[PDB]
Design an enzyme around this catalytic site. Structure first.
Site, PDB file in Angstrom:
ATOM      1  N   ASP A 133      -4.395   1.718  -2.428  1.00 50.31           N
ATOM      2  CA  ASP A 133      -4.658   0.258  -2.303  1.00 50.31           C
ATOM      3  C   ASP A 133      -4.092  -0.512  -3.495  1.00 50.31           C
ATOM      4  O   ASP A 133      -4.771  -0.605  -4.511  1.00 50.31           O
ATOM      5  CB  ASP A 133      -6.160   0.006  -2.207  1.00 50.31           C
ATOM      6  CG  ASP A 133      -6.692   0.419  -0.870  1.00 50.31           C
ATOM      7  OD1 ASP A 133      -5.851   0.558   0.045  1.00 50.31           O
ATOM      8  OD2 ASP A 133      -7.939   0.516  -0.689  1.00 50.31           O
ATOM      9  N   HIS A 158       3.409  -5.212   4.016  1.00 51.87           N
ATOM     10  CA  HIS A 158       2.795  -5.601   5.296  1.00 51.87           C
ATOM     11  C   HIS A 158       3.085  -7.075   5.616  1.00 51.87           C
ATOM     12  O   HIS A 158       3.410  -7.860   4.714  1.00 51.87           O
ATOM     13  CB  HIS A 158       1.296  -5.354   5.245  1.00 51.87           C
ATOM     14  CG  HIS A 158       0.899  -3.943   5.461  1.00 51.87           C
ATOM     15  ND1 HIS A 158       0.664  -3.410   6.741  1.00 51.87           N
ATOM     16  CD2 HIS A 158       0.787  -2.915   4.586  1.00 51.87           C
ATOM     17  CE1 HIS A 158       0.347  -2.147   6.613  1.00 51.87           C
ATOM     18  NE2 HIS A 158       0.414  -1.816   5.322  1.00 51.87           N
ATOM     19  N   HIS A 210      -9.177   2.803  -1.565  1.00 56.13           N
ATOM     20  CA  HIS A 210      -8.266   3.941  -1.359  1.00 56.13           C
ATOM     21  C   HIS A 210      -7.370   4.121  -2.579  1.00 56.13           C
ATOM     22  O   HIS A 210      -6.995   3.110  -3.179  1.00 56.13           O
ATOM     23  CB  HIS A 210      -7.427   3.654  -0.142  1.00 56.13           C
ATOM     24  CG  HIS A 210      -8.193   3.367   1.097  1.00 56.13           C
ATOM     25  ND1 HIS A 210      -7.728   2.436   2.025  1.00 56.13           N
ATOM     26  CD2 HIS A 210      -9.306   3.968   1.598  1.00 56.13           C
ATOM     27  CE1 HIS A 210      -8.544   2.526   3.068  1.00 56.13           C
ATOM     28  NE2 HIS A 210      -9.540   3.448   2.843  1.00 56.13           N
ATOM     29  N   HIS A 246       0.819   4.629   1.836  1.00 57.32           N
ATOM     30  CA  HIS A 246       0.324   5.312   3.045  1.00 57.32           C
ATOM     31  C   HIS A 246       0.458   6.823   2.856  1.00 57.32           C
ATOM     32  O   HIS A 246       1.297   7.293   2.038  1.00 57.32           O
ATOM     33  CB  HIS A 246       1.052   4.753   4.262  1.00 57.32           C
ATOM     34  CG  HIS A 246       0.634   3.359   4.598  1.00 57.32           C
ATOM     35  ND1 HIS A 246      -0.034   3.085   5.752  1.00 57.32           N
ATOM     36  CD2 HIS A 246       0.760   2.158   3.940  1.00 57.32           C
ATOM     37  CE1 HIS A 246      -0.292   1.786   5.814  1.00 57.32           C
ATOM     38  NE2 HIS A 246       0.171   1.194   4.731  1.00 57.32           N
ATOM     39  N   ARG A 278       3.898  -3.426   9.633  1.00 60.13           N
ATOM     40  CA  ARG A 278       4.643  -2.822   8.515  1.00 60.13           C
ATOM     41  C   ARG A 278       6.049  -3.404   8.557  1.00 60.13           C
ATOM     42  O   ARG A 278       6.835  -3.056   9.472  1.00 60.13           O
ATOM     43  CB  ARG A 278       4.583  -1.315   8.696  1.00 60.13           C
ATOM     44  CG  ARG A 278       3.167  -0.795   8.798  1.00 60.13           C
ATOM     45  CD  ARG A 278       3.091   0.675   9.126  1.00 60.13           C
ATOM     46  NE  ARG A 278       1.704   1.000   9.278  1.00 60.13           N
ATOM     47  CZ  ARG A 278       1.158   2.198   9.129  1.00 60.13           C
ATOM     48  NH1 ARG A 278       1.885   3.258   8.843  1.00 60.13           N
ATOM     49  NH2 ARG A 278      -0.138   2.329   9.269  1.00 60.13           N
ATOM     50  N   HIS A 297       0.807  -1.226   0.000  1.00 56.37           N
ATOM     51  CA  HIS A 297       0.000   0.000   0.000  1.00 56.37           C
ATOM     52  C   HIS A 297       0.833   1.267   0.000  1.00 56.37           C
ATOM     53  O   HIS A 297       1.913   1.301   0.556  1.00 56.37           O
ATOM     54  CB  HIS A 297      -0.848   0.101   1.255  1.00 56.37           C
ATOM     55  CG  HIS A 297      -1.607  -1.124   1.592  1.00 56.37           C
ATOM     56  ND1 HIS A 297      -1.434  -1.726   2.792  1.00 56.37           N
ATOM     57  CD2 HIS A 297      -2.473  -1.863   0.885  1.00 56.37           C
ATOM     58  CE1 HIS A 297      -2.190  -2.823   2.819  1.00 56.37           C
ATOM     59  NE2 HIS A 297      -2.832  -2.911   1.680  1.00 56.37           N
ATOM     60  N   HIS A 310     -11.590   0.896   2.084  1.00 55.83           N
ATOM     61  CA  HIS A 310     -10.516  -0.013   1.634  1.00 55.83           C
ATOM     62  C   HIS A 310     -11.070  -1.041   0.658  1.00 55.83           C
ATOM     63  O   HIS A 310     -12.135  -1.614   0.907  1.00 55.83           O
ATOM     64  CB  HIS A 310      -9.837  -0.656   2.824  1.00 55.83           C
ATOM     65  CG  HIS A 310      -8.706  -1.545   2.462  1.00 55.83           C
ATOM     66  ND1 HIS A 310      -7.482  -1.033   2.061  1.00 55.83           N
ATOM     67  CD2 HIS A 310      -8.629  -2.887   2.314  1.00 55.83           C
ATOM     68  CE1 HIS A 310      -6.684  -2.044   1.732  1.00 55.83           C
ATOM     69  NE2 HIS A 310      -7.377  -3.202   1.909  1.00 55.83           N
ATOM     70  N   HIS A 364      -3.736   4.460   5.142  1.00 57.26           N
ATOM     71  CA  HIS A 364      -3.633   4.314   3.683  1.00 57.26           C
ATOM     72  C   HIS A 364      -3.897   5.667   3.041  1.00 57.26           C
ATOM     73  O   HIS A 364      -4.756   6.454   3.573  1.00 57.26           O
ATOM     74  CB  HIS A 364      -4.644   3.309   3.147  1.00 57.26           C
ATOM     75  CG  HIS A 364      -4.379   1.926   3.601  1.00 57.26           C
ATOM     76  ND1 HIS A 364      -5.156   0.836   3.196  1.00 57.26           N
ATOM     77  CD2 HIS A 364      -3.378   1.432   4.375  1.00 57.26           C
ATOM     78  CE1 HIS A 364      -4.681  -0.258   3.777  1.00 57.26           C
ATOM     79  NE2 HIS A 364      -3.590   0.076   4.493  1.00 57.26           N
TER      80      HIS A 364
HETATM   81 CL   LIG Z   1      -2.206  -0.320   7.981  1.00 55.25          CL
HETATM   82 ZN   LIG Z   2      -6.683   0.865   1.871  1.00 55.04          ZN
END
Ligand SMILES: [Cl-]
Ligand SMILES: [Zn+2]
Ligand SMILES: *[Se]c1ccccc1C(=O)NCc1cccc(OC)c1
Ligand SMILES: COc1cccc(CNC(=O)c2ccccc2[SeH])c1
Ligand SMILES: [Cl-]
Ligand SMILES: [Zn+2]
Ligand SMILES: [Zn+2]
Lengths: 153, 153
Positions: free
Chosen positions: A83, A120, A80, A48, A143, A46, A71, A63
């Site tokens: 995403d 992640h 997002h 962020h 993370r 993702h 999401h 995100h």
């Molecule tokens: Cl997260």
């Molecule tokens: Zn997301």
């Protein structure tokens, strides 16, 4: 025409290099590179919101979600901007990343420059986890590695 | 009103955190933070062109120079956009950074987001060193630490 890059590092042994390339401001972004040190299987991937690594990957915040959506996975209308779904690590712990995305951009607006790319701990459930957290984070856990997305030559 | 941040890291002991804030789109940028692990004295302090840290600080390329000028000090008309002069380390090896600059921006074509901030081995001679390298790099020597300049909360 626009090329950006991200070096993924963290508190563990996960490290990666991710390239982004966009031919036209109106065009899809091609995302390619490699990440090593991962457990075999799916890892949430993702952009962020903050390009802030002050206290490590946690300072990157949630995100990237400029349009205030829920999401989802990259193929969903309901997602997002940040995403990008999952990358897949092989049994040697290597993810060879090859994504094409039409929602992230390198120019115009929805720009990811100066934000954080995060890989992640767990699989992103793409908003199909059946709990409240599914449509916020995708339950992808901690993370493992991150970097600020920068302008390349 | 706009806030950006950079974490400086490298191959040796030099590390820091630098904050940037701009109240108005046309306004001065305040730069503050601290760097440690430095030799006492002046260290060149620059925004470089690429937010590319794939091979460490060398991949950042030359000084950020969207207006095709020669190298100078921050208080010169004839300067690169990324020319922020020198930070000063004390006998403990700590530089307490406090800069206000009218040339860099956090929006538009002067924007430093997605570029790299570098702290150098040697003093920047601010283009007054009289040799050919002075009006390109300021003779500030190697890149001790760097980071990509990211969007902050
Ligand atoms: Cl997260
Ligand atoms: Zn997301
Ligand atoms: Se400025 C700059 C420079 C390079 C690429 C993108 C940008 C930019 O303006 N990004 C958009 C943006 C959105 C929210 C906040 C922000 O700075 C805090 C920048
Ligand atoms: C290359 O000269 C420039 C001219 C205008 C803006 C910039 C920097 N700002 C942007 O590029 C930008 C602004 C808003 C949303 C998304 C992006 Se990607 C650079
Ligand atoms: Cl240099
Ligand atoms: Zn430099
Ligand atoms: Zn310069």
């Amino acid at each position: 025409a626009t090329k950006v890059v991200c070096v993924l590092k963290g508190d563990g042994p996960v490290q990666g290099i991710i390239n982004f390339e966009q031919k036209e401001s109106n065009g899809p972004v091609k995302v390619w590179g490699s990440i090593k040190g991962l457990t075999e299987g799916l890892h949430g991937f993702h952009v962020h919101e903050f390009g802030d690594n002050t206290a490590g990957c946690t300072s990157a915040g949630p995100h990237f979600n400029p349009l205030s959506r829920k999401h989802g996975g990259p193929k969903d209308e309901e997602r997002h901007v940040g995403d990008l779904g999952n990358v897949t690590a092989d049994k040697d712990g290597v993810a060879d990343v090859s994504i094409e995305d039409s929602v992230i951009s390198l120019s115009g607006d929805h720009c990811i420059i100066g934000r954080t790319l995060v890989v992640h701990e767990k699989a992103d459930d793409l908003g199909k986890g059946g709990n409240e957290e599914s449509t916020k984070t995708g339950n992808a856990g901690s993370r493992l590695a991150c970097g600020v997305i920068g302008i390349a030559q």
